[PDB]
């Protein structure tokens, strides 16, 4: 029942090709943030240039090619405003973005956690787009683009009714510490991490 002993790659910088279904190989470079306890094949990765956190079975997915774990070391970045950061956690927020034409575009959301590994970054999700995002929110805050407002189900299966008249099954993979009724869900055949209040 043996398997090749591997270095734990959480915290590592990686790069790899990805075989698009009936398409070209695309190239990806990112940071491994986490290895999911209930499914150790599954990693959460923040890719450079992509706002969404993705979940991939990096060593198992046959679409991954030329996976390279880099020696590049992620900086042990001390937190500038530990106080401000710590208090944003679990808070509802109004997060200001910019449109194509530069017009304002405000999104209601919730700050979930400081991200592991890239710890000047934050986990955040949105009321109108409930997947896991990741930004350096202290920057948005300082620039006035982030306004703050005043048992575990992990391991269980959930079914969601797809808007295109269909159903799918996911696993509850993580409980948000600051808000224990909020969980991360991973569905098969979807790379996004869904964030739902399960109470």
């Amino acid at each position: 029942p043996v398997s090749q002993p591997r270095r734990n790659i959480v915290g590592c910088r990686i790069q790899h090709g990805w075989k698009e279904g009936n398409g070209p190989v695309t190239q990806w470079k990112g940071t491994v943030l986490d290895q999911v306890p209930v499914n150790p094949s599954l990693y959460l990765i923040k890719y450079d240039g992509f706002d969404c956190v993705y979940g991939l079975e990096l060593n198992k997915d046959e679409r991954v090619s030329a996976l390279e774990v880099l020696p590049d070391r992620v900086a042990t970045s001390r937190i500038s405003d530990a106080h401000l950061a710590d208090t944003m956690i679990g808070k509802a927020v109004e997060h200001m973005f910019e449109t194509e034409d530069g017009s304002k575009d405000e999104w209601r959301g919730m700050v979930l956690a400081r991200a592991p590994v890239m710890n000047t970054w934050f986990y955040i999700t949105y009321e109108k787009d409930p997947v896991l995002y990741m930004y350096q929110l202290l920057d948005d805050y300082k620039e006035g683009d982030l306004r703050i407002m005043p048992d575990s189900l992990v391991g269980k299966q959930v079914e969601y009714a797809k808007e295109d008249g269909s159903k799918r099954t996911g696993m509850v993979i993580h409980q948000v510490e600051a808000k224990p009724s909020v969980y991360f869900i991973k569905f098969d055949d979807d790379f996004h991490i869904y964030v739902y209040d399960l109470v």
Binding site: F50, D51, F97, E98, T99, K104, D105, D140, E143, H192
Partner: peptide, 8 residues
Amino acid sequence: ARTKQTAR
């Protein structure tokens, strides 16, 4: 402010 990525 940040630019929203329309695809993801």
